[PDB]
Amino acid sequence: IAPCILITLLAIFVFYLPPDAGEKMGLSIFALLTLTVFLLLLADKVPETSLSVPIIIKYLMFTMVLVTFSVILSVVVLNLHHRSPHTHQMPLWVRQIFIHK
């Protein structure tokens, strides 16, 4: 539980990392790799029946989904950041929402 909480905290803190550092992908994806290691840890302990899902497995899969979405949204942010000005024209509504409001 405590390693999962720490990994979740790092997944949160990825979004404060500046795009110019070039380190969002490494942090988020290594968090996912660590969570896979903890899945391997749990593989030897959890029950093997199929009538319901253990709550710890639910928490682990919730954490993995969170880290996956952190990777996805970091990719989206980097796509916006590294967008070529001459090839890509900013639509006006993007300006009104994300620069003014």
């Binding site: 899945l39 093997e48 029946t49 199929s50 009538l51 319901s52 497995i57 899969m61 990719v75």
Partner: protein, 101 residues
């Protein structure tokens, strides 16, 4: 079809040293008795049935060999394998295509 696989496991029972001419075995009922069966957390018994079979070999035309074969058709409960195996694979497969963005 694992983890959505259905099995059909039989139990052949017979008098090892006595042939049908000296000992005859007959089923008590058409089906195995599941009155005191404990519910499994990984399999569901869809069907069950016992069949009596008499076989005469060419070398032994006067000593038929009898058996009773109880078969159990079982359908796996796939929730454990869906949650623990398939969902992480789906997450990795979805993350695979994000590199092109």
């Amino acid at each position: 079809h694992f983890p959505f696989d259905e099995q059909n496991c039989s139990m052949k029972l017979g008098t090892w040293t006595y042939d049908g001419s000296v000992v005859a075995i007959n089923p008590e009922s058409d089906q195995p008795d599941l009155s005191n069966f404990m519910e499994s957390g990984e399999w569901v018994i869809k069907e069950s049935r016992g069949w009596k079979h008499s076989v005469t070999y060419s070398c032994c035309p006067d000593t038929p060999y009898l058996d009773i074969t109880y078969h159990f058709v079982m359908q796996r409960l796939p929730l454990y394998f869906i949650v623990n195996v398939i969902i992480p694979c789906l997450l990795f497969s979805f993350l695979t295509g994000l590199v092109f963005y």
